[PDB]
């Protein structure tokens with residue numbers, strides 16, 4: 493199974509990706525995480541990016557597209573994967589068609605602008621695993637600590653309010669057209685498309701997805 497998750501930053505994509513990956517065995521492919529990690533190591537594809545992310549602007553299409561192509565060439569993706577943050581522009585989506593990468597499901601998280609900032613300002617991550625927390629809406633069991641390793645959680649550098657607003661503008665300009673893009677792909681039968689209410693609590697969004705994916 494191959495899945496794309498669409499939605500504003502802070503819509504809940506990464507959070508729900510973890511559950512999908514655990515129930516259905518397909519890895520999460522999060523270009524944001526890959527970029528943030530490639531930034532960290534600085535010895536692989538996608539090293540050039542910290543200044544662009546930190547502005548809240550998208551990395552250039554070709555770079556990301558390659559990074560994903562290499563990432564899905566790994567043996568763990570061969571039976572399925574979950575794209576989370578990719579494609580993020582019409583060129584990235586067209587490059588998937590160009591490369592012969594079909595998708596079985598596109599899952600749209602509906603979450604209004606007015607909820608996005610509180611979500612992202614309170615976000616805490618465990619980078620090594622991708623686990624995502626929210627200090628209030630989905631907290632670690634122990635404040636400040638990853639549930640599994642006990643490692644102290646971090647804040648992403650792009651999770652500041654000012655930056656989050658510019659990201660949202662950028663999102664509505666370059667990435668929201670993907671909604672219509674994959675709706676048209678679904679009307680033509682080339683994918684299954686579904687819209688979920690991403691304002692519900694985490695466990696309810698989780699249950700709504702379970703009911704779509706069987």
Ligand SMILES: Nc1ncnc2c1ncn2[C@@H]1O[C@H](COP(=O)(O)OP(=O)(O)O)[C@@H](O)[C@H]1O
Pocket residue numbers: 500501502505506523524525527544545546548549550551552553556576577578579580584650659
């Ligand atoms: N597919 C992509 N194309 C271009 N830039 C990307 C892509 N994915 C991630 N980025 C960069 O990473 C940043 C954060 O991405 P991401 O972790 O997915 O944010 P969020 O978790 O809020 O959805 C983006 O603002 C952008 O600079």
Ligand SMILES: Nc1ncnc2c1ncn2[C@@H]1O[C@H](COP(=O)(O)OP(=O)(O)O)[C@@H](O)[C@H]1O
Pocket residue numbers: 499500501502503504505506507508611612614615616624625626627629630690691692693694697
């Ligand atoms: N359904 C939800 N309701 C409230 N907060 C949520 C929900 N889903 C995720 N969050 C929290 O809001 C933030 C954004 O979620 P996240 O999955 O990182 O979004 P994305 O990957 O879309 O950028 C995180 O701190 C997460 O814990």
Ligand SMILES: [Mg+2]
Pocket residue numbers: 505506524
């Ligand atoms: Mg995310």
